[PDB]
Structures are given as C-alpha cells and as structure tokens.
From TrEMBL, chain B:
<comment type="similarity">
    <text>Belongs to the bacterial ribosomal protein bL21 family.</text>
</comment>
<dbReference type="GO" id="GO:0003735">
    <property type="term" value="F:structural constituent of ribosome"/>
</dbReference>
<dbReference type="GO" id="GO:0005762">
    <property type="term" value="C:mitochondrial large ribosomal subunit"/>
</dbReference>
<dbReference type="GO" id="GO:0006412">
    <property type="term" value="P:translation"/>
</dbReference>
<keyword id="KW-0689">Ribosomal protein</keyword>
UniProtKB/TrEMBL annotation, chain D:
<protein>
    <submittedName>
        <fullName>Uncharacterized protein</fullName>
    </submittedName>
</protein>
UniProtKB/TrEMBL annotation, chain E:
<dbReference type="InterPro" id="IPR005813">
    <property type="entry name" value="Ribosomal_bL20"/>
</dbReference>
<keyword id="KW-0687">Ribonucleoprotein</keyword>
<dbReference type="InterPro" id="IPR035566">
    <property type="entry name" value="Ribosomal_protein_bL20_C"/>
</dbReference>
<keyword id="KW-0689">Ribosomal protein</keyword>
<dbReference type="GO" id="GO:0019843">
    <property type="term" value="F:rRNA binding"/>
</dbReference>
UniProtKB/TrEMBL annotation, chain G:
<dbReference type="GO" id="GO:0003729">
    <property type="term" value="F:mRNA binding"/>
</dbReference>
<protein>
    <submittedName>
        <fullName>50S ribosomal protein L13, putative</fullName>
    </submittedName>
</protein>
<keyword id="KW-0687">Ribonucleoprotein</keyword>
<dbReference type="GO" id="GO:0017148">
    <property type="term" value="P:negative regulation of translation"/>
</dbReference>
<dbReference type="GO" id="GO:0020023">
    <property type="term" value="C:kinetoplast"/>
</dbReference>
Amino acid sequence: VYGGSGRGDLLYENPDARRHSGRALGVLNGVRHSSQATMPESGQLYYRKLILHSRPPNGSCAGLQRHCHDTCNWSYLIPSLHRCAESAISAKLWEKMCQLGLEDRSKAWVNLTQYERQRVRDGQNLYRYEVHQRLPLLEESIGWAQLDDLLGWFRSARRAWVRLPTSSSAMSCRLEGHADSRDTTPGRNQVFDTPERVEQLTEATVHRIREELQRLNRSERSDCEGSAAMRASARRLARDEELSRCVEEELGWHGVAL
Amino acid sequence: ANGLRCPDALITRTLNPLLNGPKFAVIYCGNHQYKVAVGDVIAVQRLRVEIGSHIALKKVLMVGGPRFTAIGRPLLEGVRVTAQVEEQKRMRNVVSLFATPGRRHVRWVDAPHAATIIRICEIFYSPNVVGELDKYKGELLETFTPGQHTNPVYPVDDGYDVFRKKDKEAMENATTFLDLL
Amino acid sequence: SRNGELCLKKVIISYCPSNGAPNTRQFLATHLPHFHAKYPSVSIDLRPRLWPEMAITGVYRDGSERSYNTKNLSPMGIFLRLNNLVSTANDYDQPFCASHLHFQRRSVQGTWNPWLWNYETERRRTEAPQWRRKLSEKEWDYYVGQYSAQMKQEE
Amino acid sequence: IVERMYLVTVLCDAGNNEILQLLLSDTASPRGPDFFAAVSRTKDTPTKKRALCLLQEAIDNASAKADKVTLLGLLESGSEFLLSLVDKGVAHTFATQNLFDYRILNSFLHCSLVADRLRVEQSVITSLIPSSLRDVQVQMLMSNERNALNPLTSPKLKRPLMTMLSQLEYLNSIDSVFILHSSLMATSTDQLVSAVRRLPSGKDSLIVTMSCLRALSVKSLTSPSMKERIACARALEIVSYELEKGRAVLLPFSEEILLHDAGAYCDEDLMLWTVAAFLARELPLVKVHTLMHSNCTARTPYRFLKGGHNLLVSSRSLYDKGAPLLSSLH
Amino acid sequence: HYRAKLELDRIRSMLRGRARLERKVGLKRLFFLMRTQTRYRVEQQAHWERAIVRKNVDSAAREHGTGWQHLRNELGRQNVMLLPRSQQLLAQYEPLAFRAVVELCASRIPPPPPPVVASVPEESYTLWPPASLSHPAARVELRCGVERVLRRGPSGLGNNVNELIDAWKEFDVSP
Amino acid sequence: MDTYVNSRIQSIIAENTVENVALSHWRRRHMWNLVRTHGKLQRHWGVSDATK
Amino acid sequence: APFKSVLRRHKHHPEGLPLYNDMSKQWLCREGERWWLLDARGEQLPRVAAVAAQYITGQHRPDFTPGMITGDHVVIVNIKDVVMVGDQWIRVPITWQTAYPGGKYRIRLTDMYERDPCMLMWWFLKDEVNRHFVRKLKTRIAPLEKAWLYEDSIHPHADKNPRPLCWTDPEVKGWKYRDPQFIRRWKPNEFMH
Amino acid sequence: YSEARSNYDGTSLPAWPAPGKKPTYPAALSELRLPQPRMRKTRTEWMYYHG
Amino acid sequence: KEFDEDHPLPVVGSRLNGRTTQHKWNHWDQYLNPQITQSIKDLTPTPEYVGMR
Ligand SMILES: [Mg+2]
C-alpha cells in the first residue's frame, strides 16, 4: 500500500502481483530468512510489510527528500474532477446535450448517436469512480475549502451530467455484489455507502457555501461600517451579483435550494 | 476437582489449600517434553486431530505450582491437562542441499516440519497421598506433624579444619521458618 | 480455528466453464459439497472466466492472503490444499526448534534471579562434634586415656 | 523538605521506610509532587493505593485553593504516578475525573484552542476508542463487514480533533507516519517544517504526544542557549496550529494510559518506542518513521533503553500479542 | 548437473556488494552457504546445543551443591526420565521445582521397583467345566478390567464394581 | 551495593509483573531533581508559561 | 547484510580503546552482577584461575547464554602469596612473539613474578577464557575486565561488599585406609540366646 | 486424564513399605560375575533395569 | 480409522496424496466408455512405449 497506490491515487495496482513488469521477478527485495525463496509466505502482514516498505518510491510515493505534492486541497480536488469531466465529454457534445435537455427535458435522446450515449455513460462511470476515490480527501478538505471550489463541486457534476443525490442520476445505487464476497480487507480505503456519504457531503458543502456567502457579506458590511461610507467597488458589486445568480442557478439545476 | 485425598485427615486438611492457584505441568508427548501452563500455547508434532477440538494430554512427568511440586517416576496419574487444538500447519522450511564435490549431482530436499499448534486451556491435579515420607531416611513416617521439622538440619562449622574457607557469620548461621504453619 | 472461530474467511477459486482443464470442475463437482457441509462458515467465491488462473486463494480474518498453485493438479490434491488453507491460520511463520517449541515464555513459580539461592549455604546431615565444647566426664576419661596410651607406647 | 529527602533517597535507590510511613500516616498536609514522584518507583500495591487517595485529596485541595504552580506540579507528578500504576482502568478513571488533559494542555505555550477543543470533544473520543487493542485488524475487518452490510435495504459532519486511539481506522489508510521526538528541536525547526509540508499529501501523517509536548515546553523554559528556546517555542506553536487544523495526530494522556502497558514507567524516550511497537504490531502495513536528532540516545533502543537479561522476553516478543509492547526493545 | 539457480536467485538480496550486484558470484556464495549450513546442522549443531544445555543444567545444580554427573546418574536411578531440555527449562523458570528434584535425588527415598512380570491367575489351572457359567480366570480378568476402568478419572458409572459388571443382567429381558 | 540488592529483592517480591526497561533510566531522567541550577531559568515540577 | 566498518578503533588512534565495564552494548548486561571475594593464599594458580573464570564468564548462572556476556565481579586478593608446587616456578615457560625478527621472548614464572605478580594471574585468566572464547574479540576480552586483581591484601572495593566466595577443588579424595580395629559391645539377650 | 502404566495390566510391586519398616533398595553395582572392580550403575544400566 | 462419528480424522494430506496431477483417459477407459474420446490427445499409443530416450 506504500509503494503501489496511496490513499487518493486513481491508480489500481495489486501490490503482490507484478502486472507492470517486462521481466520475471528474479530477485526478491524484502527477504528475512533463507526460506523466503521456495515459499516466500507473502500475503502475511509481517512479511508483506517488509516487501512493500523495501520497495522503492514511485512517482506517486514522493520520496522523503523529494517534494510532496499538495493533494488534500479542495482547490486542487475540484479542478481534478472538472478536468476529468472535460476529458470525458467534449465541448461540442456538452453543448448538444445542454441544448437537447433545455429543449426537450430529457425526452429527445433519439437525436444523439449510440456512440455519444456510450461516451456519456463511460464519462458518468469514470466520474463516479474518481469521486469514490477522492471522497476521503474531500471529507478531509471540506473544513478549509473556498467558495469558488465549493461551487465548482457542483459545476463539475453538472458538466459531467451526473445529478448528485439528495435526501441523469448515477450516484443513487451501489454496485451490485454479495456482502459476503465483497472485498473488506483493512488498509484499503473503500467506502461502502457511496449514495449515503456523497449525499451528506453535498449537504455539508451546501451549508459551507451558505456559511462562506454569509461570511463574505458580513465582512463587506464590517468594512463598510469601518469606512463609515457606502462606497462599494464596481468589481465587488458585479462579482457578488454574478456569484449569487450562479450559485442559485447551479444549485437549482441539481435540485438543492438554500 | 482439584482436591487432595489421603486416609490421614490431618495431612489432608493441611495440604488441601496448597493446591490452589496457577499450575504448570511438564508433559511428555510426540517424543518431546514440554512445559505447559494455564494459558501457554505450544507447537507439538503433527497430530491427527481436527482443528478446534478439545483434547487431554495423557503423559505428565511433573506438576507444580507456587507452593507444591509432584514428580512422577516415571509417570504421574490423576492430572487432567486439557488443551484445544488451535491450528495445524507446516513450520518454516529447512532446505537441505546435498552436493558431492567429486561428481555432478545436487539434491535439494525441502523439509516443512508439519506441526499442530495447541493452547492449553485447563490444568487440574487431584492426588492420593499415602503419608508423610522422611528424606534422610527411607522410613515412611506413621504420623504427620506440621510444626516440627521432619528432618533437623545443622550448620557445618567444626573448628577442626583450620583452612576451611569461612563465609560470613550470618550466612553460616541462619535458621529457617516453618512453612506448614 | 481460534476460540471457536475460523480464521479463514473467503476462498477465491477461478475456473472456466468450457475451455478445458477439467481438474477444477471435477473438484467443484465432487468434493465441494463435502467441504461446504463441513465448513459452512467460510465463503467460497467462484469466478468463471475465459482464461482462469490455476490457483486457489485464501483470505483470512486479518487481511492475510495465502495462494496455492493447482495447475494440472488432481481434485484430490485441490481438496487437500483447501483443507490445509482452512487448517492454517496464516498469522505467523516460526521454525520448529527447541527454542520455538513454546511460543511465549512464562513462569508460574517465579523466574530465576541471582539473589534467589545466593544466601543458601551448605549444611551437614547431623550434628558434628564442635572443637570448642565443654567436655563431659566420659569424654574427658576417653580422650585422656587415648593420650596416655599413645604416650605410653612412645615411652 | 521531608518529601524531597525521601525522593533523594529513592533516587539513590534506598527508600527510607520510616520517612515513607511518616508521609503516609501524617494527615493535614497536601503531599507535594516529590512524594508522588518517589512513590512511582516502588511496587507496593497498598502503598500505591494510599498514594492515589492522597493524590486525589491533594488535587482537590489545590483546586480549592487555586494555586496554579502547585496544581501543575501535582499534575505532572500524578501523571508519572498514573503511568507507573498497574490498574489501567482506575488510572484512566482518575485521569478523566480529575481532567488531567485539559489542565495540562492549558499550561503549554499556544495549546489553548486545542485544549478547549479536547475538553469539549472528550465525550466522543472516549466512545470512538475501542475496548481491547488486541487484534485491531480483526476489529476493523468486522467493522468493514458491518459497513458493507447495508441495514436500510436489508447530521452536519465536523471533523473532530485527531487522536490515534479513536482514528485507528485512519492510520491503516495512511501510508507513512512520522512520530515526533522533542530532541529534534535543536538549533532549527526546518525539519519539523518539512514534516508538516507532507501532511497535505493525504498519505503522510504526524504523531505528537503529550509527553513530547511537555518535554518541548520544559526545554523551552530551561536550556543553556537561546536558539533552543526559540526553536522549541516555534515548534510548539507549529504543532498547536497543526493540531487545531486537524492534520497531525495527538496522544492525550488518557489514551496514553490506555495504550501503554501496565506498571511500566514511560517518558519522552520510551513513549516513542512503545507507540512504534504498537503500530508495528497492530497496523503492520503503515511505514513508521521517527524524527529524532543525531545525538539522541533513544535512537538505538536495544543498547540504551534495553533492560537486563530477562528470561521472560525472547527475540519474538514484538510479533506476539501476549507480550507487553516494551518487551520489543530487547 | 542441477545447479540451484532459479531458487537461489531470490535470496541474492541477503548478500552485499558484488555478490548482490552480479548473479553468478552471489549464486556460488549462496550455494556454498547453504551447503555448509546443512553440513553443520547435520553433523555438528546438536553437539554444541546439547553441550550448552548440559552446561546450564550443571551450573544450576552446582548452585545447589551437586554436579551434572551425580544429578544425571541419580535421575536415571530414580527413573524420573527428564530430558536435559526440560531440566534446563525447570532450572530457568521453576527453581523451586528443580530444587525439589535435586532434594529427591539427594534423599534416601527408595526408587520404584522394577516392573512386575505379567503373571497368570491361579484359577487358570482349575478344571472348567469341573463335571452356562463363565471361566473363573476370565471373570477375574473382567473384574480387574472394570476396576482399571473406574480408576481412571471420575465418571457417572459409579465407584462400585459388582453393579457395573452385572450390566448384562440388566440388559437381559425377563422371559 | 547492599541497599541496591535489598531494593531489587523487594521489587522482585512485590512486582507481580515483568520489568524490561533499564533501572537507571528513571534516575537519568530525574537527575534534574538531584542537581540544582542557580540560573534565571530553573526547572521545577509543573513548569509552564502560566507560572513564568 | 550486516557490515562491520573498516574504520575501526586502533591503539595508536587518539580515540583509544574502550572499557567494557563502562560500555553500553546490547549484549552486555549489568543488572544481575554480584561481587565475590577470592583469597589466593595457598591456592594454586591454575585452579584459582579456573575458579575465577567460571564466575567471571558467568558460566555458573543457569540462564547463561553464549551471546550475552554477563558475569560476576571477582576480586582476587593476596596474589603475591599464591603458591605453585615445587620446580614449576622455574620450569614453566611463558613465551610470546613480537613483530621484530627473532623476537621470541621466553620468560620464567619467577621472572614474571618478580616483574609483576598480577601478570601471572592475568595470563592464566586469559588462558582459561580463551579455552572457550577465542573466536570473538568481544567474547575473549570483555570477561577479563571483570577481574579485580590485587597484589597485597588491601583493596578499594569495600563499598561493593564482596562476598567471600567458597570453592572446593576437584582433588579432594579419600584413598582406602585400613579398617580400624575396635572392641565389640555385646548384648545380654545375645548372650542369653 | 493420565496413565500410570508400567506393565500390561498396570500392576506393580508395593512401592512404599509398611510405616516404620526398612525399605528395599536396588543393586547399585553393575551385574558383573566378578567382585572386582566395583562399578556404579550408569544411567543406561539404570534405564535397562527400570525397563 | 475413526473411533466415533463425532471425531472424524482430519483431511490434512501427505506429499504422496497432495502431489498428484490430473487423470488422463487411458486405453481401458476409452475402450469401456468411448464417449470420452473427444480429441486427438486421447489417442495415446501402446502403453509399452515409454517415450523418447
Ligand atoms: Mg539434528
């Protein structure tokens, strides 16, 4: 878990399976006893620890003396989802979908080709996967998030055409599978109630957007009172108006109302 | 079930409370001698027993506790040492590599020593004493007195020996207490 | 199996329904009902696929994984390896030696320490005649007689 | 004076039984910190019980008289006494009913927004702390199975203060954990800065302890040079900021009592190693590092912190759950 | 010739320097190491191990006043049958038990008699039938067997022997 | 040495546990109580910024 | 792979050689350390050296482990009055080799005694130790430092309170002697029957 | 439980004499037809004697 | 052989029993039930032939 894939890595590497190699495993790095050759007893915790900690740091491991990228930041996680949505759905297809939806309210899908339908479905699937991956980092960074990225949280979902759940829509159901066979081993961050955690995360980020808007308004009012004059900047006025209209419209699109 | 029995009521009443508390047992099983305790686990040689089964160990060379110890020559009887088979698996592989420097023949023999891991659950001891036995004389005493020493022991200081290496005075002269009282 | 609870949780078995290698299918047909009736607690995850991995995986109750290779292996051997999987706990790996017979050390009477039998000194079986002692009349007569006898012989 | 004389005797390893009986039988005087520091060395169980009763009485008397210096000295001495005690249950009960954590944290330099936060959230961390620290892997696997079992088909979230015993499920997700050592703060804090730079990665975490924070405070208040004081003050404010933000992991004294083995004395040097041992024993798949100085003696435990030739400890005393954690440094 | 190459390749990480960098040098080193370790384990390890355990037991006996020689001889005499490993375990973890064993060896307690040879009961010479009853020797053998049954542990069969022997009479239905 | 072995015997008697740390560690950690520094900054029990 | 650095300490190096009594290595225990007193008045040199080494190396302890070098501090007193049987002080040679060519030094026990009486006891202790520990410099040097030799009877080790170690030589043996003849005491019942 | 077995039928001679009576002792010298030399029984001879 | 129904023998196997490859159809089986001969690998030559030198 140390060398292969971290906590918020979009990669999937089975740490005990060498599927990214162009050569048979000749030498075993982490070896404790001479009897580790004919039966390495790998998979046991006390030996896979040695092996995966003797493995060298990869591009995502960010070795000690090397700098470590800021990943737990909401202001970086939001543009990640936005760029993934842009990589999934192109601008032309996005405009076509927006026009079709605003014209027929999800009733004239026959105009879209089957290839475009499959592109939309694959984009929604990849967005759901990356949200499931970033969920712990998002719940970590929700504390000190900024209003722009809190709104981008809904902007990216709208762009990817994924309606967030609220107590098309693809975050409503879980992946089918019997709980007795599903993977539950510790150490691997894998949420099991995605429609239940993303919904409360959306509620929390709505409350956070409300708090940030109220904080901006209170700071503006305190500045005006300290100046003892009603002299507001045109940039600030236009920004407040456009951000209010934008948050209203983009939350009404998802279905959440302040 | 851990009580002592003897046709002498006095010695029975004297030795009954001395058989309480934790007890260890030196046992003989699988051609090996182990020292089992109330909660100690041991890996005995491969036994044809199903995992998660309660078993009892027959041979018991010795039993002991913080106050007593019963030896068996050669074996003991009345000791109920019950364990539970925790698992059954191979141990660490030993690789025997036989190579003759004269000829061209190398033999690689792997030996995974199979063994059953067990956890000793409970240990009970209930002996049948015959009577108080004298140490310095083979005669078996007909009476038992918990106050008087069954064998008085005296210091070793004669004075006849001039070169006798003298220890400290309190080490040479130090009586003992009475445990049975 | 510790305190009445199996350590092995899942047994992953991958096979193919039409390609070949009838060993795993023989195992699933003949010995799988017996194993499932013997150990209903473990969950057997069967995976049909085109190119199956000829290996059995055991996932235990602590995340540990133990895999056995069963390529062109008889279903009897497959059943034996499965029983070895459900028998082992796969929590450690220690050799078989005199120092490893007992997994943890403990004493009920007490651990030996240099000051346990340090002040205990040697003694004698019975009381020995002292050198500085008050001689009774009988001892006086005896020793004086011995002295006089040896002096008489010398004289 | 009599208490410090008894403490000097117990440091010379010859405890005056007469002085001890006098201090234990003479009432109408709250026992100072030296007495409870000296009693911590002895192993007499009724002596420790009577010392615990006297400690409760003296803490109540100090709280009534509102003497901060005496209260803090008594807090430190009683902390050492609770670490030396055997019954972890009564030790944790005493700690949580006398409120050692909040009062001790109020004494540090910039540890106030974390002190009051811990005092507020102590009701939830206690519930999140599990019962037995044995088979933590199995416990969290059972929790994962429970979470996977959806009960439905078959409130506003606020991230609380980071604590190891409560967030055991978070360290297994964390790949690398750096445990801080007070001796690191010598002539510079850039190593601690580089440590806290890796926290926003989501993979690296930082573990500080109350013992380490107390060591930092005392070495910032007394030291031969001024660079040491400045660096330790800067490190204290950095650690306080990281804790109040919710990135580094803190060990309250209650959790320290619950984690450390029974009857074993612990300090800034032994606590690091017992935490490392607990991590390597219960959470094997997390890479643990120690941020120590190139001159600290606790860097090599098997030669400096090792005890004597003890027959009840073998070379495998770490990978077994029956042996105490401090049995690993052999 | 079967050179253990594919097996010993995976242990090269234990070596250092050129033996770990290059392949053949490390393979030669590992081959020689395993061969000499097997030879030592077969022909020379047991000697050193038993010498160590014997020295420990001798020191534990000398701290009490005896030696390995006399202790071993008297253990063989008293027929205690305790291996040197168990003697060392007792000396290290049960000093009171080891001291009691030493006191037993030192005292003049009569060692157990040799095992009695299996004898034939006197009833085997009785004419049977003397002219539907059981053989007397067989009945005595059954009685001794039931006695040995009841002698091993407590069971709900009871301490009496006649009622347990006469169980066929109970199972028999009155005609 | 006599006082040391007496204290050690008493500890072995009344411990009812296992001791695995060095016995001199506590003395090395509390040597600040034995020594005395007459500087402006002298360490005492419960020293904190609220005190100074 | 373990690795010992080539840059080791040396006798010409200013850092110097350490004292194992002051060292703090892992394989060096100091808790279970007792102080024994051994008077060498009359006792022979090899016998007293063996008796001292058996307590120095810690072989008398039941938990003795070859790796862990633990032992007791033996204070040998009255080495100046040590006794060897006749003609040995003159006939027993002590030889060694130096780096110079033909430097085969050969001294008598008398010469080594008139030079320094403690040197003889130290040499015999070194021999009795190297009898079992000669492979590792640690295992062959660390025990020797636990011996406290003293020529005269005075010694500064009065605080440690050394116990007067008692030891019996393996030479004591009673050869069969003639059964002494004495008068028999009869009995009235024996004379009656 | 346990088994104290020396022969097939678990019977043995009375190991403990009457209270006050002199106990019986085995032969310490080896079974040698010559009186000289008198040799103590080794442990292997003791094992052979005990069975 | 088991003494009771409650305590059956374990299923731990030896090397002889474990190290056993799959069964290939032999001439007796192919002559008894010719439904198994479905491929060219089933047409094995005379069992007297061991193989190449
Ligand atoms: Mg062998």
